[PDB]
Design a protein around this ligand. Structure first.
Ligand SMILES: Nc1ncnc2c1ncn2[C@H]1C[C@H](O)[C@@H](COP(=O)(O)OP(=O)(O)OP(=O)(O)O)O1
Ligand SMILES: [Ca+2]
Ligand SMILES: [Ca+2]
Ligand SMILES: [Ca+2]
Length: 341
DNA sequence: CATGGAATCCTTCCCCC
DNA sequence: GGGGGAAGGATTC
């Protein structure tokens, strides 16, 4: 079992560099403008020239400007990045029938057949990086190992523009040496819960009664960490299928006024439908981001598919249910359609 | 100050043999 | 007691 993970470098920003090479070498910040006030919004991502100074995904645009007032600030163009991503996925396809597209810039390839060992896997890695750089002029990081998780960890250690194999020998030393937090699927909240139980490295998950772990982080997450710690984790590479499509936008001013909100809501529904394209959902959920950044949602599943008129109609009742049961003002409003026929 | 899409898993019901 | 689902939320990438 040999898995090869591919991760495109500072992707959105690198695509902007490819489309305007004069940007290369300069700090580039791709941002999502929320239109509330001058430069309100967050950074979707930045190239390494910008990251070396603290500008990265998640910080407020305003804060990035105080640090790199002279960098190049660009509005995110998801659509353009999606199309460049697709072309890249199709390149990888020619290297394996078994491929899992995990996100817009992450993909796992099950090359258990194509290759016979890590050397031939590595060489296939270089061949892929080179093919993608030549065809699309986009640099990527390849991670190679026994399963998906270590393949990903491999890439994280080797970025940017790297390639790395984590052989069975290192897998074991990592199970003992690797900080539990650097394990995929372990965010801040779960890392903390684990600290309290005294688990700082994967192996530590064995010196704890399972049921106590289950109680603390849940069974699914418990079984997950244990199988990795025992070097027995092995989920197959499968193509994932879209299960929900939705869109959430930001209002210029927080509100509680139904008529002031509807517009942004219908706007989200429209965009969501244009994207559903031929797909018919039986479920709808209205999502609201409260003024204190909390997330509330009300939804309903129908016994048949939802027409756009039914969506408009039903979404307003759900938004009203939200306002009725929560007294806080709304900052962001949106919808999500799921359970496709 | 703090955008945004989406999967999966966890609880709490609820209907019902 | 437990299958079968739907809701609302927690958590992660
Ligand atoms: N907070 C965010 N808001 C919007 N888009 C985001 C956000 N965080 C990440 N993205 C995008 C950023 C990337 O272009 C793409 C994710 O890849 P990651 O974010 O994993 O890598 P990156 O390509 O920006 O970093 P790296 O230098 O490791 O390649 O998802
Ligand atoms: Ca990346
Ligand atoms: Ca990635
Ligand atoms: Ca982490």
């Amino acid at each position: 079992m040999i898995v090869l993970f591919v991760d495109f470098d500072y992707f959105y920003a690198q695509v902007e560099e490819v489309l305007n090479p004069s940007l290369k070498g300069k700090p580039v910040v791709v941002c999502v403008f929320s239109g509330r006030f001058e430069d309100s919004g967050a950074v979707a991502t930045a190239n390494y020239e910008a990251r070396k100074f603290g500008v990265k995904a998640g910080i407020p645009i305003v804060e990035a400007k105080k640090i790199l007032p002279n960098a190049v600030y660009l509005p995110m163009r998801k659509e353009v990045y999606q199309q460049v991503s697709s072309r890249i996925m199709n390149l990888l396809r020619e290297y394996s029938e078994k491929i899992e597209i995990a996100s817009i810039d992450e993909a796992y390839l099950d090359i258990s057949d194509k290759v016979r060992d890590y050397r031939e896997a590595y060489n296939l890695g270089l061949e892929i990086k080179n093919k993608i750089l030549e065809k699309e002029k986009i640099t990527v990081t390849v991670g190679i190992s026994k399963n998906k998780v270590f393949a990903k960890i491999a890439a994280d250690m080797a970025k940017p523009n790297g390639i790395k194999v984590i052989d069975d020998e290192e897998v074991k030393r990592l199970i003992r040496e690797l900080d539990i937090a650097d394990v995929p699927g372990i965010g801040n909240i779960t890392a903390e819960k684990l600290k309290k139980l005294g688990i700082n490295k994967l192996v530590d998950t064995l010196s704890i009664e399972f049921d106590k772990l289950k109680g603390m982080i849940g069974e699914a997450k418990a079984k997950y960490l244990i199988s990795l710690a025992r070097d027995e984790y092995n989920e197959p590479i499968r193509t994932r299928v879209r299960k929900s499509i939705g869109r959430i936008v930001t209002m210029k001013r927080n509100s509680r006024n139904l008529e002031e909100i509807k517009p942004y809501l219908f706007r989200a529904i429209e965009e969501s439908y244009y994207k559903l394209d031929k797909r018919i959902p039986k479920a709808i959920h209205v999502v609201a981001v409260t003024e204190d950044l909390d997330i509330v949602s009300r939804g309903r599943t129908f016994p048949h598919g939802i027409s756009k008129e039914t969506a408009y109609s039903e979404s307003v009742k759900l938004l009203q249910k939200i306002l009725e049961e929560d007294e806080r003002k709304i900052r962001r409003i949106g919808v999500r359609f799921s359970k496709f026929i």
